[PDB]
């Protein structure tokens, strides 16, 4: 942390404080003032031309100015070596994640007119010409090309940034290898642990950030779409029925999966422990017939067999829960819209858009739980590296 970034606690606290200050000044206050100064209308096109629209360009300029001011403060208060990769490299990753979320939102918005046109064409034969379908596909292809280019460049930069982090940590460790030599398994730390800790932290940060922005982007969309869904099945009219139902479904799914998926890491750790013990007893195979005797290997294999069987049973329970949820979700997407389909309050496009929003929200919750899962191994590797570094001190 101290090798790549500046002072870690202070750096992260200042980053969060400045992000909150900028969000407060923009989303409530000066954002509309700057839009009025620039004369940018609120009309956001559904095509790929929204990403160079005046609102988007104004936000890009504001983000660039804020990040530049933060970087200029941190480049003079505490100069660093990897400041250009840690301060201006994390901001780029965050911005590209937000841009990809916005691209997904644009695709979601495009999903409504396309399926509305599909329904209109299916209403009567040869009512809608094929050139309209070609134009809609062209719009989607423009958006998708933007997404492809941005995603490819994002992956390139993410990989290079991770390797720069590994390079910084490796440089620090080689600077003190003369003192860190007399530590058990130091070569494994400097080679494997550095790369795995950098990659896992990168992945966890990106997953958490992407889940947060996915929720922030797709909750207002669902709130807007809920105006065409007067009532839910069975229960009837719930004021914000669609938003409440989607949030409750995703939350209960993730809670049900996590309640039975918290016992699984303990059993996995137990299986790893007994496998390591079996390998250790198989090691000492240079000690003739004295070690690795038939009774000892028999006992250790019996232990690993029992632990594996326990893991199999518990994963049977988890599999029942997860597969049932996954099978139900496909038609639970449309179950909440059945009364609106019957009553004719929504069209094909709105129904497809609502199902897409449900899927994206569920994916955001899955990214949150997977971020926690990555944080588990991250804590493991951080404990290893912290012990390795503290043994020097």
């Amino acid at each position, epitope marked *: 942390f101290k090798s790549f970034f500046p002072k870690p606690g202070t750096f992260f606290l200042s980053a969060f404080v400045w992000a909150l200050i900028a969000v407060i000044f923009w989303q409530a206050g000066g954002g509309d003032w700057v839009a009025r100064i620039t004369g940018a209308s609120g009309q956001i096109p559904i095509s790929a031309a929204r990403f160079w629209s005046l609102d988007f360009l104004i936000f890009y300029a504001y983000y660039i100015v804020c990040v530049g001011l933060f970087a200029l403060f941190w480049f003079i208060y505490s100069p660093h070596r990897w400041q250009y990769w840690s301060i201006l490299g994390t901001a780029l990753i965050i911005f590209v994640t937000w841009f990809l979320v916005e691209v997904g939102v644009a695709v979601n918005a495009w999903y409504a007119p396309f399926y509305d046109l599909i329904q209109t064409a299916l209403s009567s034969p040869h009512k809608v010409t094929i050139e309209q379908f070609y134009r809609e596909v062209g719009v989607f292809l423009g958006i998708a090309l933007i997404a492809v280019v941005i995603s490819v460049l994002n992956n390139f930069f993410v990989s290079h940034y991770v390797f720069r982090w590994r390079t910084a940590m490796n440089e620090y460790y080689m600077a003190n290898w003369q003192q860190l030599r007399h530590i058990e398994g130091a070569a494994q730390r400097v080679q494997e642990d550095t790369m795995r800790f950098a990659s896992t932290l990168e992945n966890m940060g990106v997953s958490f950030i992407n889940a947060i922005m996915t929720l922030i982007a797709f909750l207002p969309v669902l709130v807007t779409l809920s*105006a*065409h*869904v*007067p*009532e839910l099945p069975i229960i*009837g*009219h719930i*004021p914000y029925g669609l938003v409440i139902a989607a949030i409750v479904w995703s939350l209960m799914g993730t809670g049900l999966l996590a309640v039975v998926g918290i016992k699984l890491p303990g059993l996995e750790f137990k299986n790893q422990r007994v496998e390591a013990a079996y390998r250790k007893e198989l090691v000492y195979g240079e000690d003739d017939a004295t070690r690795a005797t038939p009774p000892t290997v028999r006992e250790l294999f019996s232990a690993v067999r029992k632990n594996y069987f326990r893991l199999y049973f518990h994963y049977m329970y988890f599999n029942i829960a997860r597969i049932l949820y996954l099978q139900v979700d496909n038609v639970f997407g449309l179950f909440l819209l059945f009364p609106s389909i019957v*009553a*004719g*309050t929504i069209t094909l496009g709105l129904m497809t858009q609502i199902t897409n929003v449900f899927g994206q929200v569920r994916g955001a919750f899955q990214y949150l739980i997977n971020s926690w899962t990555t944080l588990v191994e991250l804590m493991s590797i951080y404990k290893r590296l912290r012990s390795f570094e503290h043994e020097l001190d």
Partner: nanobody
Amino acid sequence: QVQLVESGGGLVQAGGSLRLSCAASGFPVIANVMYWYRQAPGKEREWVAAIDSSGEYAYYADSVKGRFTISRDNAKNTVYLQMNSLKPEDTAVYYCYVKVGSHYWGQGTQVTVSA
């Protein structure tokens, strides 16, 4: 049970406003979402508005959002649709719908919006 009756609505010269009252008479409809539908000559019925059991929450179609207002007046069983800024394609037969065990459509009123 419930016998919906539509009253109001007639000939307007665009821009004007029209108030339609859907008076119910039978089993209480103070606990059901009550709908206003529209059928233009040459097309099928279209959803216009929906109102909660309390009148607090109102839902509108995109074509009639803002220009139309749906209100409830429970304890007299009468929903009210106010048509403001009547464009010429807002000419149609307007129906009132409520589901209480079974479906109940009203004898919709014809509204003409001349240009």
